[PDB]
Amino acid sequence: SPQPLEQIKLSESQLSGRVGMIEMDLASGRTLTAWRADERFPMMSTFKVVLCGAVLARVDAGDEQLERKIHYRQQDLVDYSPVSEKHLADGMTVGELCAAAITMSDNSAANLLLATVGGPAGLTAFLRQIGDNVTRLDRWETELNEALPGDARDTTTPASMAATLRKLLTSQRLSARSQRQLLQWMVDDRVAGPLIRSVLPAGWFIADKTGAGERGARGIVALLGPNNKAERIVVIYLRDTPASMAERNQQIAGIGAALIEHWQR
Ligand SMILES: OC[C@H]1O[C@H](O[C@H]2[C@H](O)[C@@H](O)[C@H](OCCCCCCC3CCCCC3)O[C@@H]2CO)[C@H](O)[C@@H](O)[C@@H]1O
Ligand SMILES: *C(=O)CCN[C@@H](C(=O)O)[C@](C)(COC(=O)CCCCC(=O)O)S(=O)O
């Protein structure tokens, strides 16, 4: 592979799309690689990590319990509810809902959680409270990943998302247990985690949430590092490419390969 920046550029050439990318030390926030890092990209399902950060902030404040069982109706369900459609009779706990949203990208679970934090407006206000003045959620599942050209709704920037993830995982805004829980949900991703492990060299840690949307939108927020450590946050978003899902996956994996081959920077 070429250097990470060379590879990011190649990916834009080969996709005819914009790529946005931050590589950041998790412990310190040192920015290593930044490409279009202040440009907007649709969050798509990556917003689910931020969502559960807001849920955990409520748990810490004593305003929520991960144990609390939520009962819901079939008419409440939206497209893509692999876990939540199985629990119409018995409900799901708030913690189960976050696990389903993050690890399975269950959309009804995400909407159920979104209501508890005050909807898109409430989650945006939470972002503002933790010092993210850029990221915004405007819509519910499943309309939020429409990715219309020039539309600022439901967007983040690579720099904002990486900073926000670092705040939630490491900054003591969340309690120790909550930080540990958010991390474990990302480790437990079933959508992309096992697939990424299968192509990663032995010794590399991965935790992640992925997203996809219209007009080629694609993304991943991840923790990655050698020696089985979550050394760096890596945020990659793609937009406005007509490429197949497979090619968008391969290009993101290519940026990953470049990082792996040239890790010491
Ligand atoms: O010399 C470094 C390594 O080079 C190769 O590893 C390859 C691997 O065989 C391939 O499957 C992967 O593809 C990249 C897969 C990355 C998966 C997604 C990455 C995510 C992670 C975080 C967010 C951004 C994208 O590249 C590496 C580096 O060339 C060798 O196979 C391996 O033995 C060696 O240790
Ligand atoms: C989040 O990014 C959801 C993206 N797409 C879903 C949507 O609600 O629009 C749908 C329902 C597909 O969802 C999945 O296949 C579950 C994984 C989503 C994340 C990923 O692909 O990595 S729609 O068909 O686009």
| Domains observed in the chain | 1-265 (3.40.710.10)
* Residue type at 120 in one-letter notation: P
Which among 258, 23, 52, 3 is positioned nearest to 159, based on CA atoms? 23
Ligand nearest to the CA of 201: 1
How far is C-alpha 62 from the geometric centre of its chain's CA atoms?
A: 25
Q: Measure 262 CA to ligand 2 centroid, in angstroms.
A: 31
Separation of alpha carbons 15 and 247, rounded Å: 8
Which approach determined this entry? X-ray
Separation of alpha carbons 216 and 42, rounded Å: 11
Residue bearing tokens 């409520």: 58
Contacts of 150 (CB under 8 A, 6+ apart): none
Q: b/e per residue, 87-108, with b = 16+ CB within 10 A?
A: beeeebebbbbbbbbbbbbbbb
Separation of alpha carbons 103 and 191, rounded Å: 7
Separation of alpha carbons 204 and 230, rounded Å: 9
Separation of alpha carbons 183 and 175, rounded Å: 12
Q: Ligand 1: which atom is nearest the Cα of residue 252?
A: 25
- Give the experimental resolution in Å: 1.5
Separation of alpha carbons 7 and 215, rounded Å: 22
Residue bearing tokens 């391969």: 250
Separation of alpha carbons 193 and 32, rounded Å: 24
Bridge partners of 210, per DSSP, are 220
The dihedral formed by the CA atoms of 40, 44, 49 and 52, expressed in degrees to the nearest 10:
110
Angle made by CA atoms 112, 115, 118, in degrees to the nearest 5: 155
The pick from 44, 48, 50, 80 for probing ligand 2's pocket by mutation, whose C-beta has the most ligand atoms within 8 angstroms, reads 80
Enumerate the active-site residues. Answer: 45, 143
Separation of alpha carbons 138 and 154, rounded Å: 5
Residue bearing tokens 């931050």: 22
Helices (H), the chain: 4-15, 47-60, 94-104, 107-116, 119-129, 158-170, 176-187, 193-199, 245-261
Separation of alpha carbons 194 and 128, rounded Å: 33
Which among 169, 191, 187 is positioned nearest to 178, based on CA atoms? 169
Residue bearing tokens 């590399």: 204
Bridge partners of 33, per DSSP, are 23
Nearest CA to ligand 1 atom 28: 257
